[PDB]
Design a protein around this nucleic acid. Structure first.
Length: 265
DNA sequence: CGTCCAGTCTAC
DNA sequence: TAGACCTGGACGG
């Protein structure tokens, strides 16, 4: 997902796991090339926060849990198909690559990282990816300053539609969001990023926050079929009849209305 | 049956 | 910059 999906996922983990207790180890599918999570507690709580296009899980053993353990943090990136599900322990989805098991009593459940295509990754450290900018949703002011302070960077030489996917400056913005954001301001996607940003030192950086916030407010996105209908109705540009599309220089499709802009292939 | 379409990560 | 990493749904023959 993009920032809204990662944020909604962290809300899902927090609400779903609020009154649950996990115990045991953290089980990884054999096909997953991500790392074994070395963690075991008889009793632990799982919580989450999102930052841009990453989600951090905290594994927090209860007072007296055994073996002795300090809380463990994991950072996840979802790639194209990452998600979290709470399922019954013996009805694991097909691509459940990492699982946390509730402890008794009550119905035995599993929190699963589900990633069909396996583009998602996790690391043990618990730290955000060095180089990712601040979260367009939760760190708006830091995000805004981080762009306006570094317009000399060669990243802003590129078309604006390309610059919007550079996670050093737009941590959380993905393909649908770049289309939806430029269509609201009818900024051509192949206008030069520095030209559109230089003129700011509600504008484009504000919509980098407010547009994703709109997606979050829809709620849901399986966090199931009706939630999906609401997102489809919300979209104005991405994939919509009457809209043009081109390939950016990395082969990713940009949707827009009218003028493609000066740097079009 | 086939092609094509849907965010990093890394070797050239 | 170009290809690599993957699976499943749509659609075309």
């Amino acid at each position: 997902g993009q920032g809204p999906e990662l944020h909604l996922a962290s809300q899902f983990v927090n609400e779903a796991c609020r009154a649950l207790v996990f115990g045991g180890c953290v089980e990884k599918s054999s096909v997953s090339r991500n790392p074994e999570v070395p963690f075991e507690s008889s009793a632990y709580r799982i919580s989450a926060s999102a930052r841009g296009k990453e989600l951090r899980l905290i594994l927090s053993p209860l007072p007296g849990a055994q073996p002795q353990q300090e809380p463990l943090a994991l950072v996840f990136r979802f790639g194209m198909s990452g998600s979290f599900q709470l399922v019954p322990r013996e009805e694991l989805p097909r691509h459940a690559h990492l699982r946390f098991y509730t402890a008794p009593p009550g119905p035995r459940l599993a929190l699963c990282f589900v990633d069909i295509r396996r583009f998602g990754r996790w690391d043990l450290g618990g730290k955000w990816q060095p180089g990712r900018g601040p979260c367009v949703l939760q760190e708006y002011q830091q995000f805004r300053e981080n762009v306006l302070r570094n317009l000399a960077d060669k990243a802003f030489d590129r078309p604006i539609c390309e610059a919007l996917l550079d996670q050093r400056f737009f941590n959380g913005i993905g393909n649908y969001l770049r289309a939806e954001i430029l269509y609201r301001l009818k900024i051509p996607p192949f206008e030069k990023a520095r030209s559109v940003l230089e003129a700011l030192q509600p504008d484009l950086l504000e919509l980098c926050h407010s547009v994703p916030k709109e997606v979050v407010q829809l709620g849901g996105k399986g966090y199931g079929e009706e939630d999906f209908a609401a997102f489809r109705a919300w979209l104005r540009c991405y994939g919509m009849p009457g809209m043009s599309s081109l390939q950016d220089r990395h082969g990713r499709t940009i949707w827009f209305q009218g003028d493609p802009g000066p740097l079009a292939p």
